[PDB]
Amino acid sequence: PGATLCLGHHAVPNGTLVKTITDDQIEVTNATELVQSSSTGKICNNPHRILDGIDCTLIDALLGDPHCDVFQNETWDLFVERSKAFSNCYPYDVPDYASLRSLVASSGTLEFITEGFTWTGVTQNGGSNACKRGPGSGFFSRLNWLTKSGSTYPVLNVTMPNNDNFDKLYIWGVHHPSTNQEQTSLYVQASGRVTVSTRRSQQTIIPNIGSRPWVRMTSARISIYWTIVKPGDVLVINSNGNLIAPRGYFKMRTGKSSIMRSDAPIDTCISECITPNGSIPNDKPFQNVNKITYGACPKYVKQNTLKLATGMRNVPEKQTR
C-alpha cells in the first residue's frame, strides 16, 4: 500500500505557433509579437516639434512664396510636406533641389537676417503678376529682383563679410528671360552674368534666353543657387545683369531636424516614433509599417509578424475524439 508522486508541467487550451531552429511552426503556451504592424493614422504633435507645411514645400517657404509667408522664421524638428502643396510665385527651378531641401530641412530653421546690400545704379524690389502679393504684383520675400535704373545696369560688385561665428546660408538666383527683348528691356546688356564667390569657392552662371512652358503668366524662369559663407570668409557678388539678389542670410544650425512627406493628420498625443502613415509605438524592436521613420523607432523589417515564445512547449492531453 504505497504512493505515487508525479512530476509535470502546465498546458493551456489555446497555445500559439512559433518558429525555432528546427521547426517552422511549433506550439508553445504563450508568445509575444515583436513586429509593430499598425499605426494610429495620426502624427503625434509631442514630443517633437512638428511643423505642418499645409500648402507649402520647404523650398517655397525658404524663398518666401506669398502663400508661405506664415512660415517666416519658423523652426521644426520635423517639417511635414503635404501632397496638396503647390507653388504660386515666379516659376523657378533649383539645380540640386534635393540637396538644398536636405540641408535646410536638417538645419531645422528658416531664421532670416536681413543685410544691407548696396546695389548702386539699379532698381530694386522688382515684381511680377506671376507672384501676386495682395492686389498687385510681387516676388519672393527673401529675394530682390534687380533691374535697370534709367537706361543702365552697371556692373554690380558688392561684398558681405561674415564677422559672426556661425555659418551663413545665402540664397540667390539668376533670371532666364524668354526673349532678347525681355533681356535688354530688363538688364540693358544682351547677355547677363552672375558670379558669386567666397575665398575658397565660386559659382558662375550665364543666363540662357529662350521659352520654357508657360507657368502663371510667364515663359521665363529663375534658377536658384546657394552659397554657404563660413566664419572669417567673405561673400562677393558680381553681375552685369540677371541677378536675383539675396536680401540677407539664413542662420544655419545642426541638430535633430528633418523633413517627411505625409498626408497623416497631426493630433494631440505623445509618440517618439513618426512615420508617414502616422505615429507608431516603439515598445517592440521591429516594425513593418514604413521604412521611412523619424525619432526613436523600431527597425524596419519585411516580416509582418514575428513571435517570441514566452512559455514552454504546449502539449495537451491526447484527444479521444
Binding site: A3, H10, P13, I21, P285, K299
Partner: protein
C-alpha cells in the same frame, strides 16, 4: 527539447494546473491532489523575462536620413540610395528572423531543462525510498500521508525516517 522531459518521457501537460508552470500530483491512501512548485516556475519565468527585456530594449533613435521614395527617375544616385535601403532592410530582416529562432529554441530547451531539474531534485531527495517509473512519476514504497507529501514538495523530507519501511517493500 534537449532534455527529453517535456514532450518526451512526460506524456503531456496539465491544463488543470493554473497556479504554476511545474508541479506535483500524488495519489496516497488519503486521496489525490495537486500543487505547483513555485521555485522551478520562477526560475523559468525569470529567465524568460530576462530575455524578453533584453530583446525589447530600445537602441536606435534616428533623425535626418536619406530619401527612400522618389517621384522622378534619376538613374545612378537613386539606384544607390535604393540599394542601400534594400540591403539594410534585408540584413535587419535576417537578424530578426534568426533572433526569434534562436531565442525560441532556447526557450523551449530551458523550460524542458527546468522540468528535468525538478525531476532529478525530487529523485535525489527520495534516495532509496522510491523508484523511477519512467513516465515522470515516482512510486514511493511507504505510507506517505499528506504531511509526508508536503514534506517532499517543500524540501523537508527526511529519507532516513522511512528508509527501513521502504527498503523492505522494494526487495520482497
Amino acid at each position: 527539447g534537449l532534455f527529453g522531459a517535456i514532450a518526451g518521457f512526460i506524456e503531456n501537460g496539465w491544463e488543470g494546473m493554473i497556479d504554476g508552470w511545474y508541479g506535483f500530483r500524488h495519489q496516497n491512501s488519503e486521496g489525490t491532489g495537486q500543487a505547483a512548485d513555485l521555485k522551478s516556475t520562477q526560475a523559468a519565468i525569470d529567465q524568460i523575462n530576462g530575455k524578453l527585456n533584453r530583446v525589447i530594449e530600445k537602441t536606435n533613435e534616428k533623425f535626418h536620413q536619406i530619401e527612400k521614395e522618389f517621384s522622378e527617375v534619376e538613374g545612378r544616385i537613386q539606384d544607390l540610395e535604393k540599394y542601400v535601403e534594400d540591403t539594410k532592410i534585408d540584413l535587419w530582416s535576417y537578424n530578426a528572423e534568426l533572433l526569434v529562432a534562436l531565442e525560441n529554441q532556447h526557450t523551449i530547451d530551458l523550460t524542458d531543462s527546468e522540468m528535468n531539474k525538478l525531476f532529478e531534485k525530487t529523485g535525489r531527495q527520495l534516495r532509496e525510498n522510491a523508484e523511477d517509473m519512467g513516465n515522470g512519476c515516482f512510486k514511493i514504497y511507504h505510507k506517505c500521508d499528506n504531511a509526508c507529501i508536503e514534506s517532499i514538495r517543500n524540501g523537508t523530507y527526511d529519507h532516513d525516517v522511512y528508509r527501513d519501511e521502504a527498503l523492505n517493500n522494494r526487495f520482497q
